Amino acid sequence: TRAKAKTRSSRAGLQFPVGRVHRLLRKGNYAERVGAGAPVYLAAVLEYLTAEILELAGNAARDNKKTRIIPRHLQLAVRNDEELNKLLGRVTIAQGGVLPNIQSVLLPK
Amino acid sequence: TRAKAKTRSSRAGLQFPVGRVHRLLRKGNYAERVGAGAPVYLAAVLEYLTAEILELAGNAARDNKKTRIIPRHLQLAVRNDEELNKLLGRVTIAQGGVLPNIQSVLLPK
Amino acid sequence: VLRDNIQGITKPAIRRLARRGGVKRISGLIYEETRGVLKVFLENVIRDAVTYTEHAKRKTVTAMDVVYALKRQGRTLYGFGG
Amino acid sequence: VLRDNIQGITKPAIRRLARRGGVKRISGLIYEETRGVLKVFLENVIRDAVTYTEHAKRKTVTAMDVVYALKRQGRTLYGFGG
Amino acid sequence: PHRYRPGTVALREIRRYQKSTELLIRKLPFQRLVREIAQDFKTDLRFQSSAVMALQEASEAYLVALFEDTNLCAIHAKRVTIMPKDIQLARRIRGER
Amino acid sequence: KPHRYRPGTVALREIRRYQKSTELLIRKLPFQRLVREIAQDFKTDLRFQSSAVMALQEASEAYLVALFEDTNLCAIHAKRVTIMPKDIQLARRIRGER
Amino acid sequence: TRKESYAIYVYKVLKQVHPDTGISSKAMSIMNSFVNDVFERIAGEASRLAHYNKRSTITSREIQTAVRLLLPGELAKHAVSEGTKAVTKYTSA
Amino acid sequence: TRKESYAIYVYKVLKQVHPDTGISSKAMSIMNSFVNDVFERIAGEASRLAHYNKRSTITSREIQTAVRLLLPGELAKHAVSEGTKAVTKYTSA
DNA sequence: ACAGGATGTATATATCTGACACGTGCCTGGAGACTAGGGAGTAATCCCCTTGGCGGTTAAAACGCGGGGGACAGCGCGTACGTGCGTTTAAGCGGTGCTAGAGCTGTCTACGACCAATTGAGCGGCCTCGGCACCGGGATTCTCCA
DNA sequence: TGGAGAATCCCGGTGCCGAGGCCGCTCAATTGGTCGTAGACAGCTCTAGCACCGCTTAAACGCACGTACGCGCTGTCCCCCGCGTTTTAACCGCCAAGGGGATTACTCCCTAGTCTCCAGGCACGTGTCAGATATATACATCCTGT
Known part of the structure; x- marks a missing residue:
């Protein structure tokens, strides 16, 4: 006579898993005990960051007249922003490239 | 009818404690279990490094015609060496000072 | 309320710091740059120090908070507890 | 036994790298410096990679060893597992 | 015949690359x-296919960044050509020396 | 006539002394x-221990001395003896703080 | 042999943001690495923060303080708002 | 309230090296901080190394590999020799 | 290239004082002696993926030559920074007083770990089609020399 | 300021291989209940952080003078760039053999947990000696004139 089942993500109204995050926290040698509210917070933060990056990358991809996302678009989206460039300051992205810029002294005149 | 007691440091022939290191390892959230040979190794390494630094500092202090060690002597001993300067590359020592050097271009002639 | 205290870093002190650095001649526009750099550095450290203090429900800033804040940015300090 | 393979980094490749860097004119003594710098960097990474491989009692170097060795020195890499 | 002035093809290549x-x-x-360098630390080693690719990616990124810093140092001294002194100064300020 | 020193001797003497x-x-x-004025913005009615200010001063002075050394190197690279703000800006930009 | 990743949730978020847009495998690998890196950073900072105050539990306050310490600028503000809203909604039900 | 430090052992080592030489309090604080820092570094590296290989124990091999990874040059060689000798002597008795 | 005067600095001697080295008492954390269970070491099997060799084709590397523009040294003019002196202003020191907040007990409850039974979400394997890479031809733009 | 010419851009047609969606099933997340301790709350004590006052003197401030350094201009010459030929090795398919990286079952030795107890290490006094502070002396260095 049980009452079926409901995932904690549905209760919290999220898309990222909560039970998996709880298990990962409990088996990572971080602390002796883990509370009941930390996984929800962590999942929400991760989902927010992912959504931000994906939106910027999709804008770049549409600007280049394509319907798929490739590492070049991610590189452009990260490097053109300010806060994201601050966050990923010492990270290398494979098959990324560089931003185009030339010093003004070298230009012909 | 017990057989008295003997510290593990005496068995290992060391000066640094072993039981305290074992306790610190077991309560630091590093791993689920701790072996029986790690504390001896760690204590030996720590003692060796301490002896090296102290010898160099004492040499500097005697060179300056003193019988006590002050942070200036530690700074001189660390910075004049190569391996130690490599190890403590991003550490600030209070009341230390700097090494004396002047660029050759600035000298009068 | 305090205001206009950045001017307390007089030019003789900057000259002494430059002398310990090994500088021989100094231009007349270095002092404003030095003051700005120092202000930025102090703000960056103090924000984290205050955050550490506030997490523990205290009203007094201790030395361990400063030590932790300095360590978090890659500048370890020896001599004040820790 | 292999020997004298540093000469396989020809000057056209260095010129292409400089072009992507944004350089317009190049002197005639840059190539030896570039080769030395590259050799030092490769030695530093490969030593730690081999140490990681040897701890696990293996005879093949995997990509995860390289990723860990790069991460330990403050150069994180995205794209190869991890 | 037709010839270009010294400096045009360089800019074209800069944009292209x-x-x-x-x-x-x-x-x-x-x-x-890579194999020759790895010979010294241990003998009779084998490599996966992707480790070499990862190493090459990292090396190229490092070199490009170093060249950018060298160009800045060269410009600071009222010049257009890069010389070894610029590389040495860039490496010394960065803390690698 | 009174006694005077050539421009540059007292500077070297001070360099050695300091x-x-x-x-x-x-x-x-x-x-x-x-320090108190800067800390005012983040939170109001704060109190400080005696040693926190000392630690802050130590760190600040070490940082400034290192920066000045790098600035002097940058100034020498361009065939000059006087340091100018361009050297500070270049030293900070190469180091990665900008 | 079973292997775990974050592909499904990333795809769901992408379909939420841009309804008609695909993604290749290399970008998926990059996204997976990014998520793992951020997770590790936040967890380690929270663990150290809990150790300083002589506690043996990790709660929402540690996560919030770690987020404030790590992220710069407006990202911290928006992340704090999102986390607080999520926890408040979860507790009610 | 009890507080722990490494003063006694540092003093013993100093008396071993230089028989007649003192030390002030500030240098003692600096030495204490140095010892704590090195301990923390080695322990963290060993913990990560054990986690990579799917083990749940820390042994002498992890400590040795961490020492080889951390220290540069001859310091690693001499430290390895000292640790091996100490363990060998301890096991016999 | 020297002589000598003027200024800054290292050396040797005599008096205080407070910080460091040592002794004593007490308590709590490390050592000795057992038991119980599961993590890791060892042997055997399977099959994937790394190393080695061969032949053909065309893209990339090496070589030589002719000019032109940029790196480098020398000279001259002007102004801004270093040195020294007289006057003004807060830093540093030694007391006194007051109270806010840090640090330590004692009681109690509600929250997280642990266990047993149940089922559905996520992973591996498989097909299928359309998004993008490639080729060919025409249009537009930028550079260089009279 | 005009033409020639070389490099870049735009548009339309073919084809193939990688990304998207479906199915079976099994292992990990959910539901329900028990229990013991980690942390919340109230109260009290004594340390240390803040504010005020007077005084002596060291450091900050303002001004005048003159010299050395930063900056612009000109000329000579060499070294690097752009282009056409000839030679070398990278790249792509295909085949073959075997070393070593993943699994699975069994067993045993090493580590966690508990109780007793007793020395090593910490907090608190006490005295003396190493170092700090005056004072006279002699040696070293700089700068102008000869």
Whole structure:
């Protein structure tokens, strides 16, 4: 006579898993005990960051007249922003490239 | 009818404690279990490094015609060496000072 | 309320710091740059120090908070507890 | 036994790298410096990679060893597992 | 015949190579160099296919960044050509020396 | 006529003198007032221990000395003896703080 | 042999943001690495923060303080708002 | 309230090296901080190394590999020799 | 290239004082002696993926030559920074007083770990089609010399 | 300021291989209940952080003078760039053999947990000696004139 089942993500109204995050926290040698509210917070933060990056990358991809996302678009989206460039300051992205810029002294005149 | 007691440091022939290191390892959230040979190794390494630094500092202090060690002597001993300067590359020592050097271009002639 | 205290870093002190650095001649526009750099550095450290203090429900800033804040940015300090 | 393979980094490749860097004119003594710098960097990474491989009692170097060795020195890499 | 002034093709190449995202070094010489270097630490080693690719990616990124800093140092002294002094100064300020 | 020194001797003497010692080179009360004024924005009605200010001053002075050394190197690279703000900007930009 | 990743949730978020847009495998690998890196950073900072105050539990306050310490600028503000809203909604039900 | 430090052992080592030489309090604080820092570094590296290989124990091999990874040059060689000798002597008795 | 005067600095001697080295008492954390269970070491099997060799083709590397523009040294003019002196202003020191907040007990409850039974979400394997890479031809733009 | 010419851009047609969606099933997340301790709350004590006052003197401030350094201009010459030929090795398919990286079952030795107890290490006094502070002396260095 049980009452079926409901995932904690549905209760919290999220898309990222909560039970998996709880298990990962409990088996990572971080602390002796883990509370009941930390996984929800962590999942929400991760989902927010992912959504931000994906939106910027999709804008770049549409600007280049394509319907798929490739590492070049991610590189452009990260490097053109300010806060994201601050966050990923010492990270290398494979098959990324560089931003185009030339010093003004070298230009012909 | 017990057989008295003997510290593990005496068995290992060391000066640094072993039981305290074992306790610190077991309560630091590093791993689920701790072996029986790690504390001896760690204590030996720590003692060796301490002896090296102290010898160099004492040499500097005697060179300056003193019988006590002050942070200036530690700074001189660390910075004049190569391996130690490599190890403590991003550490600030209070009341230390700097090494004396002047660029050759600035000298009068 | 305090205001206009950045001017307390007089030019003789900057000259002494430059002398310990090994500088021989100094231009007349270095002092404003030095003051700005120092202000930025102090703000960056103090924000984290205050955050550490506030997490523990205290009203007094201790030395361990400063030590932790300095360590978090890659500048370890020896001599004040820790 | 292999020997004298540093000469396989020809000057056209260095010129292409400089072009992507944004350089317009190049002197005639840059190539030896570039080769030395590259050799030092490769030695530093490969030593730690081999140490990681040897701890696990293996005879093949995997990509995860390289990723860990790069991460330990403050150069994180995205794209190869991890 | 037709000739270009010194400096036009350089700018064209700069734009061309700043637009793309490919590798700029031949693969077999790099693999041979990696194996030769690894010979000293241990004998009779074997490599997976992707480890060499990861190493090449990291090396190329490092070199490009170093060249950018060298160009800045060269410009600071009222010049257009880069010289070894610029590389040495850039490495020394960065803390690698 | 009275006695005078050529421009540049006293500078070298001061360089040696200040490279020999290990003291603090900034007055204490202005630094404490500056620290309190800066901390005012983040939270109101704060109190400080006596040693926190000392730790802050130590760190600040070490940072400034290192920066000045790098600036002097950058200035020498361009065939000059006087340091100018361009050197500070270049040193900070290469180091990665900008 | 079973292997775990974050592909499904990333795809769901992408379909939420841009309804008609695909993604290749290399970008998926990059996204997976990014998520793992951020997770590790936040967890380690929270663990150290809990150790300083002589506690043996990790709660929402540690996560919030770690987020404030790590992220710069407006990202911290928006992340804090999102986390607080999520926890408040979860507790009610 | 009890507080722990490494003063006694540092003093013993100093008396071993230089028989007649003192030390002030500030240098003692600096030495204490140095010892704590090195301990923390080695322990963290060993913990990560054990986690990579799917083990749940820390042994002498992890400590040795961490020492080889951390220290540069001859310091690693001499430290390895000292640790091996100490363990060998301890096991016999 | 020297002589000599003027200034800054290292050396040797005599008096205080407070910080460091040592002794004593007490308590709590490390050592000795057992038991119980599961993590890791060892042997055997399977099959994937790394190393080695061969032949053909065309893209990339090496070589030589002719000019032109940029790196480098020398000279001259002007102004801004270093040195020294007299006057003004807060830093530093030694007391006194007051109270806010840090640090330590004692009681109690509600929250997280642990266990047993149940089922559905996520992973591996498989097909299928359309998004992008490639080729060919025409249009537009930028550079260089009279 | 005009033409020639070389490099870049735009548009349309073919084809193939990688990304998207479906199915079976099994292992990990959910539901329900028990229990013991980690942390919340109230109260009290004594330390240390803040504010005020007077005084002596060291450091900050303002001004005048003159010299050395930063900056612009000109000329000579060499070294690097752009282009056409000839030679070398990278790249792509295809085949073959075997070393070593993943699994699975069994067993045993090493580590966690508990109780007793007793020395090593910490907090608190006490005295003396190393170092700090005056004072006279002699040696070293700089700068103008000869």
